[PDB]
Structure formats: C-alpha cells, structure tokens
Write a protein that binds this ligand. Structure first.
Ligand SMILES: CO[C@H]1/C=C/O[C@@]2(C)Oc3c(C)c(O)c4c(O)c(c(/C=N/N5CCN(C)CC5)c(O)c4c3C2=O)NC(=O)/C(C)=C\C=C\[C@H](C)[C@H](O)[C@@H](C)[C@@H](O)[C@@H](C)[C@H](OC(C)=O)[C@@H]1C
Length: 138
C-alpha cells in the first residue's frame, strides 16, 4: 500500500487480528494493541489502506492480520495519535469512534508491508516504550 492514498471505496477499514465475521457488531472497550492492560474507549478505523494494513500487522494476537470494512453507528473524529503529530492534519485518514461499528465486509486483496519495514516499525515502537515516549491517546 501507499501512505495517504484513500481507498477506492471511500469505505472505513479496520485492521485487527480478531476473528470477526460479516454481520458482527463490535463495541468499544477491548484491550489496547499498544499498551498492555489499557481498556479502550474507542474503535479505530481509517480510510487509507496503508493505515489499515498497519492496524492488521501491529494488532496484538496470534494468527494473521485481517482488514474489515466497517460501518460506524455514531460520530467519528480524527485519531489524535496521528493527527497534527508527525504531519499537519490527518493525512492517513485515521479516525476513532466512541460508539459500536458493524462489520460489513472483509478485504481480501491486500499485501503487507515488506518484512524489513514492518520490523523497523516494531523495533521503533519497542524503542519508544523503552524510552517512555509511547504516549497512547484514547
Ligand atoms: C496510521 O499510523 C501508522 C502508520 C502511519 O504512517 C506514517 C507515514 O504517518 C505517520 C504519522 C502521520 C504520524 O503522526 C506518526 C506518529 O505520530 C508516530 C509514528 C511512530 N513512529 N515510531 C514508531 C516506529 N518508528 C517509525 C519509530 C518511531 C509514526 O510512524 C507516524 C507516521 C507514519 O509512519 N508516533 C510517534 O512517533 C510517537 C511519539 C508515539 C506513538 C505512539 C502510539 C504507540 C502510536 O500512535 C500507535 C497507537 C499507532 O497510532 C501507530 C503505531 C500507527 O499505527 C496504527 C495501526 O495506527 C502508525 C503510526
């Protein structure tokens, strides 16, 4: 995938290693993928495939990444972890919602980041943790 490229569909995507199926309704309050033990207030979704693939790859869990197309029941807002942080605005088109979402499809035709790019991201995040700089906004 290409960073900042909006998916053809305009649809909201959710990358995860959870075993979801079309027709599931997902409510907030599951555990963070980035800070063990943290109970989440939001569901995180995106309109770029690149951000969804990172969500699938970086999600906690055994088993492979999945990307779902989802329909929010309620309001969505910019995800502050990636908005006005490294870049101005929200170029990854990443959002979050306090209300449930429905799983309406599964994206089957994606490929992951090349392995050294995924390893660099993983290593970078462990480093931020080791330095106490991995602040999670939620
Ligand atoms: C869609 O976002 C993805 C890719 C964007 O593509 C791309 C090109 O545009 C980015 C934007 C616009 C950012 O604002 C950004 C950012 O703020 C950030 C890191 C992190 N960089 N490092 C980690 C590895 N590394 C390169 C060295 C340091 C980034 O790489 C990016 C970044 C990119 O890479 N944040 C930090 O540095 C700091 C200080 C803290 C991070 C804290 C928590 C832990 C994270 O926020 C968690 C909650 C997730 O939100 C991220 C892991 C995102 O994963 C998902 C699934 O969302 C990932 C950024």
């Amino acid at each position: 995938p290409k960073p900042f490229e909006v998916h053809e569909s305009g649809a909201y995507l959710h990358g995860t290693k959870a075993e979801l199926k079309v027709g599931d309704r997902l409510v907030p309050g599951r555990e963070s993928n980035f800070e063990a033990g943290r109970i989440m207030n939001h569901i995180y979704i995106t309109q770029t495939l690149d951000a969804a693939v990172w969500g699938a790859e970086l999600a906690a869990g055994e088993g492979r990444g999945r990307i779902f197309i989802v329909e929010p029941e309620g309001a969505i807002e910019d995800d502050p972890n990636v908005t006005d942080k490294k870049l101005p605005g929200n170029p990854t088109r990443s959002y979050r919602t306090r209300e449930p979402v429905w799983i309406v499809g599964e994206l089957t035709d994606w490929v992951g980041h090349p392995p050294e790019q995924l390893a660099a991201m993983r290593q970078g995040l462990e480093e931020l943790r080791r330095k106490g700089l991995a602040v999670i906004y939620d």
